[PDB]
Amino acid sequence: GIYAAFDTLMSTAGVDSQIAALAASEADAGTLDAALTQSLQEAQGRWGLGLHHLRHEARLTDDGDIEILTDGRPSARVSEGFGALAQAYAPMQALDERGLSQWAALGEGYRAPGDLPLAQLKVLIEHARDFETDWSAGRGETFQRVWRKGDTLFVEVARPPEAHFTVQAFVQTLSGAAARNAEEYRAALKTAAAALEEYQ
Amino acid sequence: GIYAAFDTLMSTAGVDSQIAALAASEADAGTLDAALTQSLQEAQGRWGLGLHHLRHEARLTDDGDIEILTDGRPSARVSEGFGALAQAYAPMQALDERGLSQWAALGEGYRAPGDLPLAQLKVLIEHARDFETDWSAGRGETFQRVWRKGDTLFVEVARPALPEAHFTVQAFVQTLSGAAARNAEEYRAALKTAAAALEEYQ
């Protein structure tokens, strides 16, 4: 029931969550919650809603539902459907003329230009702490940006009914030492763009 | 009195705190606490103790003393003298073979190499958020580093100066705030200011 409903929601993001199978295997609630949350976080990167600055979680409820949270606040219930979920996210969003998010991924603060020479962006990747670029138009009608939070570099390539959920972006991550390598950044952009083109 | 004692402590850092004068004007306790705290923060930049990552405050006590706080915890009282203050700070410090601090100013996290090329440092100043470099060698036996926390860029030039209780000017920190903190051409100018000032003290 509700597990299959979650899987259906995830499928709109191209996320093969397999929650129905996990529940069928008699997983405990903790294992399910962790899986629900990991899947929802992946889906947020795919849907292009522009809410990277919020923490996204999902959890089983006593009444056989799945609660969807942002920053720890109950925001929606899976049983209520796509329209209800889109309505919940809508007031949190800020979209530009292209359908791209106007929020920084890191929250309030400085964002670098999105069209820097690679020679300069390399310095940020290698030597900054957390940082972020604004969107820029890239190859093949796409748009791209990057941010680092802690030891994960997030490389986003995007190409944008209100209740409709679909793949609008792909986020490729580089973690640990990989998060500080500018040539691996170039590779991740190619990966994300190629994946996005496949979905669209 | 205790206000003159604090001024004496501040003088070892080349800080003309004028607390005795503020007290003489019968400023309120909150005003004194703010002035004491601002002065202590300036002194910390001059003494070269390497405690930029800690919050430094100074406040009147109810029994006529001035308490020095580090991260909110009482560390020493001004009435207890230089020896007690140095003993309080010593276990917080981590100094290299040169007498330069081994702590990052920003705390745990990535620090760029000290000898990062100037042109690349400029990119950090213009386009990063918080960032920090390790020490590099400068002219005349000095060493320098730079970091930005929020909207303040800090440029430190140091030349370690002696008894453990001794306080003296070992460094100078020039700051740039607001839009000035993101102007890459400011770095060389601030470096020159700090180096020139340090030379005058020593």
Draw up the topology in text.
2 copies of one chain form a homodimer.
Chain A: H1 2-11, H2 19-24, H3 29-47, E1 56-60, E2 66-70, E3 73-77, H4 81-89, H5 118-127, E4 131-132, E5 136-137, E6 143-149, E7 152-158, E8 169-175, H6 182-199
Antiparallel strand pairs in A: 1-2, 2-3, 4-6, 5-6, 6-7, 7-8
Describe the protein in words.
- Two copies of one chain form a homodimer.
- Helix content of chain A is 36%, strand content 20%.
- Chain A has 200 residues and is of the alpha+beta class.
- Chain A folds into two domains: 2-92, no CATH class; 118-199.
- In chain A, the strands form two sheets. In chain A, strands 4, 5, 6, 7 and 8 form a five-stranded antiparallel sheet that branches. Chain A has a three-stranded antiparallel sheet with strand order 1-2-3.
- In chain A, strand 2 (66-70) and strand 3 form a beta hairpin.
- The radius of gyration of chain A is 17 Å and the shape is globular.
- Chain A starts with a helix and ends with a helix.
- The A-B interface holds A 106, 109-110, 112-113, 116, 120, 123-124, 127-132, 180 and B 106, 109-110, 112, 116, 120, 123-124, 127-132, 182.
Largest interface, per-chain counts? A-B, 16 and 15 residues
Order of helices and strands of chain A: HHHEEEHHEEEEEH
Main beta-sheet annotation of chain A: 5 strands, antiparallel
Helix content of chain A: 25-40%
Q: How far apart, in Å, are the first and last alpha carbons of chain A?
A: 29 Å
Principal-axes shape call of chain A? globular
Number of helices of chain A: 6
Radius of gyration of chain A: 17 Å
SSE class of chain A = alpha+beta
- Oligomer description: homodimer
Total beta strands of chain A:
8
Q: Work out the strand percent of chain A.
A: 15-25%
Number of domains of chain A: 2
PDB class: dna binding protein
Keywords: DNA binding protein
Assembly: dimeric
Entry title: Crystal structure of PprA W183R mutant form 1
